[PDB]
Ligand SMILES: Nc1ncnc2c1ncn2[C@@H]1O[C@H](COP(=O)(O)OP(=O)(O)O)[C@@H](O)[C@H]1O
C-alpha cells in the first residue's frame with residue numbers, strides 16, 4: 472500500500488515549513504509512516520550551489536539556476552519512489568510549483584519553458600497552497616535577506632502560482648494560512664489523512680504529462 | 681558586424697576536437713577574430729560535476745545530469761552573446777545536439793523532453809555534422825573509458841542525431857569526416873568562411889523556438 476506524496480506550497484511566511492514539520496509529527500503520532508522532505512535540498516552538491524545563490528554569495532545565470540533547482544528534485548526521485556513504494560508518506564516543503572513560480576516571476580521566462588525540466592517528476596497526490604494576506608504576513612516578522620525576498624518579486628511569484636492552480640490535473644487544496652498555527656495544522660492534517668487513504672488506490676502519477 | 685556561431689557535432693572519433701582547433705587557427709590566420717569553446721565546459725562548478733560523472737567517478741540520476749549539461753551551456757550564454765556582438769566568431773566543439781542525442785539514447789527519454797532545457801539558447805548559424813563509418817572510426821584507436829563510449833550506445837545516439845537533423849530551422853551541413861585531417865579541415869573551413877560572411881546579415885537566433 473503506497474504512501475502519499477503531499478506537497479506544501481504557499482506565500483512567504485505562509486507557514487510551509489512550520490506546517491510540514493507539524494504534519495509529519497502528527498501523522499507519525501497517529502501510526503502512519505511519514506517523513507519530511509524540502510526543496511531545495513541544500514545538502515547535495517547541487518543544493519550547495521543553490522544555497523549559495525539564494526544567500527547572494529554567488530551569482531548564477533537565471534536559466535542555469537532554474538535547471539539546477541529542477542536537477543535538485545530529480546536527484547531525489549529514486550528516494551521518493553522507493554519511500555512511497557514502501558508505504559511511507561512524504562510531506563514536501565516546496566516542490567516544482569515554487570521552481571516555476573519563482574523563475575516565472577523573472578522577465579522573459581514563459582511558464583511553459585519553466586515547467587519543462589520538471590515534467591515527469593513524481594506527481595503529488597495533494598498540493599496544499601497556504602494562502603495569506605500581505606497584512607497578516609507582515610506580522611510574522613520582516614523579510615529575509617535571501618534572494619527573492621521582496622514584495623514586488625513575491626507578488627509576481629504569487630501570480631505565477633495562480634496560473635499553476637488552473638491546472639486541473641492536480642489535486643490542489645487551498646488552506647487559509649491566516650489562522651493560528653494549530654488551526655491551520657488541523658485543516659492540513661485532516662486533508663492529509665484523506666489523501667493518504669486514497670493514494671493507496673491509484674498509482675503514483677507523473678507531473679505535467 | 682557580429683561573429684558567427686559555428687557548432688561541430690559528429691560521431692565518435694569523427695574529429696570534432698581536432699577540426700574545431702584547426703578551424704579557429706585557420707580563421708585567425710586569415711584575419712578573423714575567432715575563438716574556441718567546447719561543451720561540456722568542465723572548468724565550472726557544474727562542469728566539474730559533469731566531468732566526474734563522465735569519468736565514472738560519480739553517479740548522477742539521468743534527468744539531473746541532462747539538466748546539468750544544459751545548465752552548463754546557459755552559464756556561458758552571457759559570454760557567447762558578448763563575444764558574437766563584438767564581432768568574434770565562436771567555434772564550438774559539441775552543443776545542445778550532443779546533449780539531446782546522448783540522453784535521448786537512454787531508455788524512456790523522449791526527444792521532446794530532452795530538447796526543452798536548451799530551448800532559447802543562442803542558435804548556431806552553422807551546424808557541421810562530421811559523418812564517419814564505424815570501420816573508418818575503428819582505425820582511430822580504441823574506445824574511451826568514459827561513460828557512453830561503447831558501440832551500442834553510440835549507435836542509439838547516432839539515431840537521435842539523425843532525428844535532430846530533420847529540423848529545417850537549422851543550417852545543418854554534413855561533412856565527410858572519413859578523409860584526411862587536412863581535407864576535412866578544408867571542407868569545414870570553406871563552409872565556415874561562407875557562414876561568417878552571412879551571419880553579419882541576420883540577428884542571432886534562438887534555438888528550437
Ligand atoms: N499561522 C501562523 N501564524 C502566525 N505566525 C505563523 C504562523 N505560521 C507560521 N508562523 C511564523 O511565521 C514565520 C514563518 O513561518 P515558516 O513556517 O517558516 O513559513 P514559510 O516556510 O512558509 O516561509 C515563523 O516565525 C513562524 O513561526
Ligand SMILES: Nc1ncnc2c1ncn2[C@@H]1O[C@H](COP(=O)(O)OP(=O)(O)O)[C@@H](O)[C@H]1O
Nearest residue numbers: 692693694695696697698699820857859860861
Ligand atoms: N580525419 C581523420 N583521420 C584520421 N584520424 C583522425 C582524423 N580526425 C581525427 N583523427 C584522430 O582520431 C582521434 C579522435 O579525434 P578527435 O578530434 O579527438 O575526435 P572527437 O573529438 O570527435 O572524439 C584523434 O587521435 C585524432 O588525431
Ligand SMILES: Cc1cn([C@H]2CC[C@@H](COP(=O)(O)O)O2)c(=O)[nH]c1=O
Nearest residue numbers: 510511540541565566569570573574
Ligand atoms: C524549490 C525552489 C525554491 N525556489 C526559491 C524560493 C524560495 C527559496 C527557498 O526558500 P525557503 O528555503 O525559505 O523555502 O528558493 C526557487 O527559486 N526554485 C525552486 O525550485
Ligand SMILES: Cc1cn([C@H]2CC[C@@H](COP(=O)(O)O)O2)c(=O)[nH]c1=O
Nearest residue numbers: 719720749750774775778779782783
Ligand atoms: C555536450 C554534451 C556532451 N555529452 C556527452 C557526450 C560526450 C561527452 C563529452 O565527451 P567529449 O569531451 O569527448 O566531447 O559527454 C552529453 O551527454 N551531454 C551534453 O550536453
Ligand SMILES: [Mg+2]
Nearest residue numbers: 487488489564
Ligand atoms: Mg520555509
Ligand SMILES: [Mg+2]
Nearest residue numbers: 696697698773
Ligand atoms: Mg573531442
Ligand SMILES: [Mg+2]
Nearest residue numbers: 583587792796
Ligand atoms: Mg512542449
